[model samples]
Target: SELLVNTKSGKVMGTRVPVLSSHISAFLGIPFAEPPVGNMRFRRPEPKKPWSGVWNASTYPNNCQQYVDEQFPGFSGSEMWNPNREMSEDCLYLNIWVPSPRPKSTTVMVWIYGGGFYSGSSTLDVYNGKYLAYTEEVVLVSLSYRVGAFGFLALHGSQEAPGNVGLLDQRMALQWVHDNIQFFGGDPKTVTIFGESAGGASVGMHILSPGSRDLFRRAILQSGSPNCPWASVSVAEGRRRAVELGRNLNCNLNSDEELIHCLREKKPQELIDVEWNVLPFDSIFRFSFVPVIDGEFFPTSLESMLNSGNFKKTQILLGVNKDEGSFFLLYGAPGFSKDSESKISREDFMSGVKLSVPHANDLGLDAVTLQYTDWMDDNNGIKNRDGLDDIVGDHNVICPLMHFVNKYTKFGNGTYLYFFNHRASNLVWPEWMGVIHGYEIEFVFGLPLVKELNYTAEEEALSRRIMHYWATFAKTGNPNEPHSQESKWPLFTTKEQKFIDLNTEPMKVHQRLRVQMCVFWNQFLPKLLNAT
Candidate 1:
């Protein structure tokens, strides 16, 4: 399987595998930047220098260092989500899957993974591009970037070591693809960048980032947004945390320079070992260490940028899982209960709601409570927990995404939306958790096409149809008729809220997604704060 392609860095030999009617040339673990080790650790990523010989790219690269949690072993939660490989600081590589018999004009789809900006690798089995690439006839790609403290440490007013180098890592990888995808049979001009969860949020970041907007023409945001509360923080607060990190590890100093110098002398795991002493509500609403609005990278408030139309005008496709907050209960703030499917009390649910809503002392949240409650099974703790799932999902992901969609329609060239309501029947999680966050990945990558997981014929069909739409969007920036498959997916804008419900019967077009819930979260709660 002698498949070789010349990159800007150098020529690399790849593995070739036979697919349905054609074949795939997979170039995995191609380093896009120099290893960000030593003094280069906290700095902006430098493009990798061209190596001397023909590089071998047959294996996946290392994942950026993260706290790989062991949530219920032998189950879907722990295994599917965590970085399923070795970790390192030298993990600046990307994987590319090129479908055979494709011309230079073939559409390119780049994937950015989501892991709360901490736990993800480009090498997940579910994200493998073989089937998706072959079936869709598009070049599929995924890249690894730094995560956890290694990726997002902010040093306040210091330019020598600013925050968001991970984002810079992502930007550099995109630059590599733009420069070299052509050699592997791809159209750099017609590129669609897509991701799930934090990866989805990363797509949102790239859309708004001045350094990144020009690189991609289309974006797919799956259950993540730049406006999500946990994804970012203020400059002063971020720097404060960085200094606290120094104090925790015995490196606190008067100046940022001195502190950074001391930190550079320490081990990487020493930084990783710094645990979060988060607030009561923070366990659900926030990620402890994440991107900072350092004024250099983010520049301005995400809302202000969206409201004033200062961001990128790319074609957009966005969606969310039905019960996004349910899975988060397991991973985000673990210690809910020892049991996996246990109940949370009404008081516990109300406490979270009260915390999420600003000036709850003044607002007197009667309507909010009524809107979320399941009137049919009105007063049970399990049902209250169900309501909590929806509430958290709305606040953390779903509603913020609506804020983005509302503004992007004004500036974006083409906008499409969907609600992923389908969940695999074979999953070990309880039935109450309907289609939790990131359940759509296997379908997105066509893993059902390869893995023998006893997927229903319809589920496999759904995967094929999804690949068709994803690749069609990459090709024409439209999903209705280019592939001539499922129900017609309409354009989404401010006027009418229409989207394809990615559920049974080949997807039905639906509108008015959680109308009351969105209003309760976005308008009523904020309006209450403004009243004072």
Candidate 2:
């Protein structure tokens, strides 16, 4: 049976999709904003117009076009991983799933997909909301936003094409949900925005944006933060990239108006087809294009915003995988291979460390080397390939996240920290990668033991616990209720530094997650290099 609902935009008819033994009503391909085609390209999103008749939201709309087929090394080749999709300029759509017997005023979870702010879509199979919606008794939403130059190009600090337009697209979708989620039996007040990688950074970015303050009440950040080096760039750099893109497309460089006109005239694929063949540093931490600190959307530096307390005060859940950098090194570094060529020499390791932290001098690099080394010998003895991955993980993902949480928790924000260490039994990569980046998505989305992928009984149990914790946090600020089976996920404070180690066995609350390592990377090294 089709479910009919009247939204602010128009009436939408949602179809039922079969879940585990039961069906959930799913409203797919619902437009939240006016299509960013023609004159709307590279501009702030406009609200979607109302339709006179019922909109059939049964099929998924096109994805924001980008280079989705190109796979980097160390990629996961699983049957459930569907990366390619139909592409289009008119791609700002959102999907919603509700349980069969929809609860009145149910909690809502909106997911923003991550692809380094370059490419991703809401139509991915991994992002399907049926399982979480049915099992957790919560409405699940997955939204699409523009990516690449089409969404993030900045020019001459003009309002015509400000950077972070991709973020603005997300903000509009959130506002649309705020205005219309009630039609789907969702409590607008209890909406929680969450995502992974670039998506997680988008959630953090929303927290920093004054325009997005009242849209979402709670947030969940998975393996990303606004403080990460790749999260945002300077306005000067944003303009430089935009100019370079214009020159690539043979646009006039003198007048910003001419450049804008020339760009708008080009095909959408021409803008997204640009590639990042050369890296700024030897490190893979650098991204070619990302959200910029435009004066309008991002008024000031992220550090400045945090210092000034100019962000939304909301309950936050932040975490990272145990081996977040393993895949990066495996895919990005030169001379990298699964065979004998994979060994990283001491010189190469030091070079990579120095490249990753440009501000760090020899002494600071030596200090980092001393702390992250596997061997006791100080004289170039650390020579394992996997050792570099561990250092990269701590430097890029883990330490930055710790710094972010420390700053937020110091100011009395209700923040919960977690460390995801569980590795699924059927992962595509070898055990050397450990619990690498993006391995949690399958478990978080309840894909394990759900026929889409091969998973163990223990994995399924952990998935249920994760779903419960996430849905409960959406319903209430606290992740754990008195009636839940899992242990209380403690509030992170500077005094306690307690975080839940999410694993298959009985979960344990541990104090000082990587305390000693964090002290060196998050505290000592930054001060030594004179960087925040």
Candidate 3:
């Protein structure tokens, strides 16, 4: 019925579930902070009022107000709604999965889901913790944090508190895990914080945040890049966006204090819709709730923090997919009218994207665009250039991530990098969306619930290896060096500059894409900004 645990605060109740009469202790949607609702909406997370009675740890909490429609694009209220949910500002909850039948020894994996720092849910199907727990004999944990307005807005007056509330929410969750996960059979000393996309970016922020020191032992960053397209924009630029949002909503908050109070008074769903409506801006060169560069929580630029040797030493695994931007083409491109499924002329799409590159060059743009066009024609056999251009444009957006690899491999404690190249060819048109964003997550979790698509035997094997590597990384500092059959994965180094490549072909380990683009990025970006 109930599992017993010792605590300085008080006794906590965790429910026990029976699978084939074997006991698995689980705690779902346990609060880590006082709900960030009402007066607390725009402020730093505060401790929850501890309860004197036993709390129900049964159902998973609602993920912070998300773009509910985006997850299941065509589905409506009945298919997507969870009626018994608390749609409130009080949504900082975490779910724990313990493999230990009773309290016993185990390592822990705390997964952070990716949704561009604006939308994502801990309750999503890709993140279920059962398989990893049952197979690896390790504890599994996932956390839900505030997104969009409640989590990331820097209201003119809200500077009284930290600006990146979503990131702060994560700090609070890790702190909670440090204090309590042992009861769920996890060793606090052996915690690995892992995530993909914005979630991967969040893990990197955790690595750099002064507040996160000594909290996690290792980190896994899949398809995450360090520099934000928005980080290139100034605080003044952010304020301008906020002002525009206020005008769109017809809310008045003229002064700093008025701005904070006005933003605090709006409904969460209204803010979420507005945020999603404007997500296209982020796709090109803006961010609504990016991991803030506030002085305290995030401190310095993530790359600079590593270069300056300011953060703790830990093991890290980082990688990105080959066609990282295909989904943006499929989802973000405007002229994308699809009667027979969307396709953009490669040449047309890339010209628009080149304008967004921080320091795009006149002489270089044509060359770069031409190179990608040729590659698209050869690989995907594109008759039209518009759709091909969309893929290239998406890649151009995150092209700077290679710099993240180079910098961290050279300056940080330790690192590993990989690029996903597997394309689901049978899925029909726009195969270029090949191994697009968030594609690896389902595989990594070994979730095989869909009928429209299926994984090859090789894909299944790779999934097992990813799970094994991740679980072992949590237990020890080395993911490749675990007591398993995996080949010795080399520790990434600048000279070696080696990264593991994942694809349907015979995968290999080698240096990542050429850094010519990186050189161009550094050379012309500052001048471009000043002139613009």
Candidate 4:
């Protein structure tokens, strides 16, 4: 009646999670790596030694320290995110929700949780995999990795040090699954890696990473793309931040070993607190601990990898919520007032265009921006486009996503893109926010039981459709082929880019959104642009 799962600290804990009672006769969590603390922080993950004891698998594991902030105007900090949850250095633990006695041909779905590469853990309420695992007849898995400064600080002398410790930890976890999952009644060859937000970004990172390419056979990336600004790291900024941290802490970077030693000597909370103080919110975006584009673990840049057809022969499904940028407006756009909207003129619009234009290509910026501005002007046909303010959020979030799909579908890999259109009644104030960043998550996970959503009934139907699609995709490679009532899926292609819109009634098509964001990003951001 007992299961064995290894904790990140190398301690074996007996856990009693529910799935084991229903299907999987046995389950286990073996530590895939040594604790990433003290001297081990920010270093490449080290494989753990196999233990002799029959460890129990009943509870979820510890996660890296999480930071909570309620910048969502009126929301309280504790209400926004529970700050009193457990935290620790030995946080690299993974959870499994396998059918009792396990299936002879169990498909495994490995989940990676997201919190903008900084906060979040594998143990959130929304990601409960037990029911899904039981109903779908598959093994559900979730794992934790280092986040924030402890996981991704890239320094100058750090060339000798691993840059993306977080990514490496994930890779190690997958490696653990590869070796141990079979014993728990799951098939190693049928593994899929899927995640949302930063976790989805990590899935894209893994798709583009040489180290992670062969690890999983299929992938699902919801509300995430490889080319998004937060997807990769800047090495120069990393080193600069590292030096700043060292200077403030009075550590000598010249002695790399001692530098790590001095850092480890500081308490985990102290490290988290100092990082919060040193890098304010604005600076944090530029300095947050995320997976770096190291030459090894991450290998080539997302752009280079995609352009070169570098993804494994893995089936991929990716898309974003209709209103991803609503979060930016709610959380970051406090200063832009109604007066600012009115004062915005053509000159200001053009000037703002210069600042926000895509750095990836030159052909599409002006045309796309003009087209988007025209849409804003049409206000259903009014004149002023509000000086680039009208389409800034759309351009920043959506176009990069299109570029990702274009580059990926052309690689001959099985790729599908979707636009989540199901809206919830909860808009978090200011009224017209549409389907926001975490909105789809509610449907995806069937949150709040979703009754209060304006389109709750329709959204629930679509949620069932999507859940089946995703579970089917993880079970096999093709999500659209099996389901009886769902519409057939067409693979995304450079010429006939297809989208499966998840709404009241899901539909399939090409070029759904008419806003000129993609065109503008392609034109103005050539550096970030990857031509199909």
Candidate 5:
């Protein structure tokens, strides 16, 4: 039989697609906000007006205008995580997957995709929720929001061009889910929002955003944090990039008023292309167009907001991979992405360190280089490459995430931390690239069961357990609570700091990760900045 959900905006017909042993009620491409085009560009999304008739929600919708790397051919394929669907400015839609044999008012999980604030769509193959929803028996949701300059450009003095419209788009979509999920058997109260990389950082943004209050109860941030410099930008820097774009494209930017008006008139592709070309070097540090300290969304610095105790009191499951830096090493370090065999020269390794911390003082820069170096061997080629991975991974993701949790745990909530170390057997990259960034996604989505990705039997079983751990958390606030036979996944607190070590075994609970590494990066490094 067919299912029609009467959303707050309109009626939508959902399809029943077959999963492993059963079927799932799938609602694809449900628009939660009006098309962010023309006059609506660069502004917060408005709720989609009520539609005329039964809207088709059988297929995925248009992804927001994507930012493509024009120069690097290697960064264009699956490894680069490019958008696959027809992309447009009119892409403020969301997808829903409800299990067939689930209980009424079931737990809900929402997904926010990652792309360094300029990439990704919620509808990627690896993120498909049919398998997840089917096995977990929870209501699953994924959303598509504005990316690139269309989503993050901020004209400093212009309220019309507020930065972080992309995040605002996610807020609007969550509101829609809150108001309409009950019609689709999802418990609005227990909605858990989760994501990785840029998406994980977006989840953290929603956590701190006052506008996102009551949108979700539990959050999972996988290898992403707003504390990371690449995830945030000052409004001044954002406006500079905006005006630079206008200057490059011949748009009159004498005033904020004229700049925004003229920018809206330019082709979306032109704006996207210029967003890259306008970057100072168009490298990883070139994430010029990202979230700003907008008062409505983020009233102050993340620390100030967290200290005020005004942020969400939601449960959090946060983590990073052992070799998260190995993936990014390919970018600023170059050619390392193609294969693990590529070595890092002293020049390239030093260049990577400079890019990682461009403003570091002599003392701080020297400290970072020494921290990651293998003094025993004092090697330069392959050893330097591994050290580069350590520097990039720890500084960019791991340390920043720990800092966020440090601030968050002050609220006295359940905070579970993890360290994912599973290297997919299917990965063509060398074995030494141990559990590189984003490898956990396929297992989280249960793709091993769906298709032959060369997952060993043990890895497939590991996927099932991981899903159970995630779903249990979504069901109740705690991953260990409600008593799954799984070994206890410990909480990360100021006093008793610990994390779950995830690989192809029963979850291993361990004390604080990289003690000296985090101390040097999060503690010592900052002191050097002030002293120097």
Candidate 6:
């Protein structure tokens, strides 16, 4: 029923699935590391023990434990992106798909899912590799790592409870792929690591990590970066959160040794039950358990590492969706009803700016408000909605991305930037907010093959072109070549700052995207923050 491939750990039998006219061999739920259970909890992942016989890799495995609201209204579209399998602590698994009738040494692209660093799994249907693998003729890999307290809890100087095991787990998966991909007809040398949101932040952190030096050749970050404010927690704050977590679980231990032991002994469900508290500053951007400034994996802050030339030298394709903030404000804000009466007041706008910005008091809130306000009244009297969304987007995602891109390009590295402006007809959000965060993933993966999503002919075509661009980039450093059908995607230069605008019809290269707003945030805002 499935094709058998001999791996370093064992011989695995992968099933074949039809896509279009051709087929792809899928090896699902293969363990890359030993189950981090019992005494191994809170410790770094180790290699999985070698198996004896042919292991069936046909079915999806248990996903990492996360909150399940089974009673919630169905057909919400959110469920499709989350894992449907039973939750478990022994979830360090990876999935792979290869084009059937295997080609010679195909490029490999590993995807990391995004859920604010607290939740996500490779079992999500949207991440099915059949479409991308068969259509692009590349090996696709998606992996599941520990999340929430299990993955990111820090215990100050304790080696046993040191934070960022999630990252280490990802690193292990990468190493496994590098070692065993050849058996699946994949080139170990040419691997592109790509992800969205918190997963994007993870990719950026990997680029900065000295430990991840030879794991990946190229990195693609969509709508996130290590420089984003919520991407890292300070050591002091991380310790406090770790202590609070121990207390919440009734451990209440003072010494790091005692705490580590107590946490390890507790049931995984107890840790998962504790609610992640929202930070005081920004409701939209706070992450309770994200990567921290660990002295080893992360020697320093990502911004510091970039400035000091401490990151791995690799080709990068980084960009953000046009309306990243729309996903944040859609449910959180006070006035986002479907009717025309929905409006965010001026007071609400002022409050959000003060809360979200790092140094709004020093920059003068009045000036910030005026800078973001749409004076033309184009947003249906909800000037604050448009204005605050713009400010939040710039503050949390866009500005930080641009700043990092600027610094990285100055290093004379191969960096390409783009702005995703395409709005699909199948999207659930309104058009006023433009292309929302994570929307490009559907197009990038070419979702017409996904039965749940009703994609148009043009959308399917766009997905094909995007797949070519991405796959070509993974094979070679450039997205465009003599054989490609898409337009030439230019590099992001220090002088020109050019980027490709990915939209429905007539994709073109543009220079200086959101120049004025970016200048205000990158140049003026930093000076204001440092002045205080």
Task: Give residue 5's error in model 6 in angstroms.
Answer: 1.1
Which residue pairs show collisions in model 2? none
Per-prediction TM-score, please?
0.94, 0.93, 0.85, 0.82, 0.95, 0.93
Residues 1-532 of candidate 5 have per-residue lDDT tens digits of: 4468777788999888988877889999999988988988998888898998999999889878877654456543343466668888988999999877535799999999987888888888888999999998999999877888889888766778888899989888899889989988899998999999989999999888877867888898999998786888777777788889899789886798888899989998888766766665524544767898866688888878777776888789989898987766665565465645767776777778877776686687788988888777655677987888888888888988988888888894789899998887777666657787887888888988865567888888879878888888888878775555657887788888988888887667788787779888888999889988
Off by over 4 Å in 4: 2-30, 70-84, 156-160, 253-258, 276-287, 336-396, 426-430, 448-455, 483-485, 506-508, 512-515, 527-532
**Candidate 2 global lDDT:** 0.81
lDDT, candidate 3, 150-248, per-residue tens: 677764335543467788888888988888887667789888888887788788778777788778888888877556454322345446656666666
lDDT tens digits, residue span 151-245, model 4: 77676445435568888889999988887777566889989898877888788788887778788889988777667765566677666666667
Q: Would you list the C-alpha lDDT of every candidate in the order shown?
A: 0.80, 0.81, 0.64, 0.64, 0.82, 0.81
Candidate 1, position 330, lDDT: 55
Q: What local lDDT score does residue 200 receive in model 6, on the 0 to 100 scale? A: 92
Clashes of each: 1, 0, 8, 38, 1, 0
* Comparison by TM-score, 5 against 6, better one: 5
* Best candidate according to TM-score: 5
Candidate 2 residue-wise lDDT, 1-532, digit = tens = 3389988899999898888878889999999889999988888888888899999998888888665544434455422333446789889999999987876798999999987888778887778888999999898999989888888877745777877889989999999999989989899999999999889989989988888889988999999988787777888887887887887777898977888888899887777676353234445766656899876777888888877777888789889999887766666665455433455677777766775665567888788777767676434332555667777777777877787788777664588888999988887676667897877887778887496577888989999888878888888888888686647788988899899898897878888877778788866887888852
* TM-score of structure candidate 2: 0.93
Off by over 4 Å in 5: 69-80, 101-103, 280-286, 334-337
Which candidate leads in lDDT?
A: 5
Per-residue alpha-carbon lDDT of candidate 1 for residues 193-259, written as tens digits (9 for 90 to 100): 9999889999999999898988988899999999887789887777777887888888858898888
Return the number of clashes found in candidate 1: 1
RMSD of each: 2.5, 2.7, 4.1, 5.1, 2.1, 2.4
Residue 339 displacement (Å), model 5:
3.8
